[PDB]
Design an enzyme around this catalytic site. Structure first.
Site, PDB file in Angstrom:
ATOM      1  N   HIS A 103      -5.481  -2.827  -0.181  1.00  0.00           N
ATOM      2  CA  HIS A 103      -6.307  -2.299   0.568  1.00  0.00           C
ATOM      3  C   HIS A 103      -7.500  -0.863  -0.175  1.00  0.00           C
ATOM      4  O   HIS A 103      -8.515  -1.532  -0.102  1.00  0.00           O
ATOM      5  CB  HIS A 103      -6.176  -2.050   2.055  1.00  0.00           C
ATOM      6  CG  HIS A 103      -7.214  -1.695   2.702  1.00  0.00           C
ATOM      7  ND1 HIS A 103      -7.903  -3.673   3.459  1.00  0.00           N
ATOM      8  CD2 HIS A 103      -8.564  -1.534   3.484  1.00  0.00           C
ATOM      9  CE1 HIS A 103      -8.581  -3.468   4.052  1.00  0.00           C
ATOM     10  NE2 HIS A 103      -9.005  -1.688   4.552  1.00  0.00           N
ATOM     11  N   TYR A 128     -13.477   5.890   0.102  1.00  0.00           N
ATOM     12  CA  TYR A 128     -12.069   5.408   0.757  1.00  0.00           C
ATOM     13  C   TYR A 128     -11.504   6.045   0.552  1.00  0.00           C
ATOM     14  O   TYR A 128     -10.723   6.532  -0.329  1.00  0.00           O
ATOM     15  CB  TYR A 128     -12.238   3.652   1.382  1.00  0.00           C
ATOM     16  CG  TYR A 128     -10.500   3.495   1.521  1.00  0.00           C
ATOM     17  CD1 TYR A 128     -10.882   3.266   3.365  1.00  0.00           C
ATOM     18  CD2 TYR A 128     -10.073   2.587   0.914  1.00  0.00           C
ATOM     19  CE1 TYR A 128     -10.250   2.978   3.900  1.00  0.00           C
ATOM     20  CE2 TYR A 128      -8.720   2.672   2.102  1.00  0.00           C
ATOM     21  CZ  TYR A 128      -9.558   2.144   3.498  1.00  0.00           C
ATOM     22  OH  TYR A 128      -7.948   1.755   3.847  1.00  0.00           O
TER      23      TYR A 128
END
Ligand SMILES: C[C@]1(CC(=O)O)C=CC(=O)O1
Ligand SMILES: C[C@]1(CC(=O)O)C=CC(=O)O1
Ligand SMILES: C[C@]1(CC(=O)O)C=CC(=O)O1
Lengths: 115, 108
Positions: A34, A47
């Site tokens: 991810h 992120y």
């Protein structure tokens, strides 16, 4: 000074709980995938994903039980326009498809900086 | 590497939302130069979108998110032992009604 401006960006923090049936070993691998997928995500400045490793319960103030959280995610967006480029992105849609695979339940908080 | 602990904060039922916001700011100000502490951050929860693309998780009303960073296990112990740290936590008892700590681990 870069970090200060960065701290005042649009930031969304997420609590992740893995699918019931997925092993912890696989869940950790899918968090890593991810993160790899976040690179070059349209509109996204940053992120971060981390596992929850410890759940201390001896808090000085009353302890809040929110059940078992497996990981914490966070996104930073440098402007309202950049957030919109993200929210419109096909690439984000495909990121969320991977999300549906390894994230069983998700709580997002939209945060507000105080300083 | 860097120890991080993230916190979910719920204000005391005796306190207004605005009072709580003011105490968050005071709590940040008190943290400057805290022994053993690399960084502290506190932010309000301003939005609770429920329109999620995977199943939505309900954990109730969280008012703020706090977070501490420590350079090393040695620094964390210096912090735990510190008198000024103990006084800062006493301020915590005043403006934090319920707390959930997460000790995190990095993946990349
Ligand atoms: C922003 C996003 C995308 C997704 O959930 O798949 C949501 C949580 C997360 O860690 O990444
Ligand atoms: C709140 C948010 C933000 C995002 O798109 O990452 C919107 C949907 C979702 O699953 O998380
Ligand atoms: C690290 C700490 C210290 C305290 O409990 O006052 C715990 C949560 C928080 O926001 O600050």
């Amino acid at each position: 000074q870069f970090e200060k401006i960065e701290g005042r960006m649009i930031r969304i923090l997420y609590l992740l709980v893995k699918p019931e049936s997925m092993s912890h070993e696989q869940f950790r691998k899918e968090c890593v995938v991810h993160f790899q997928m976040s690179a070059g995500m349209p509109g996204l400045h940053k992120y971060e994903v981390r596992l929850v490793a410890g759940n201390p319960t001896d808090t000085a103030v009353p302890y809040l039980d929110v059940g078992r959280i497996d990981a914490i995610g966070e996104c930073w967006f440098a402007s309202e326009e950049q957030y919109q480029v993200y929210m419109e992105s096909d690439i984000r849609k495909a990121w969320f498809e991977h999300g549906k695979y390894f994230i069983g339940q998700l709580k997002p908080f939209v945060t507000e900086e105080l300083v």
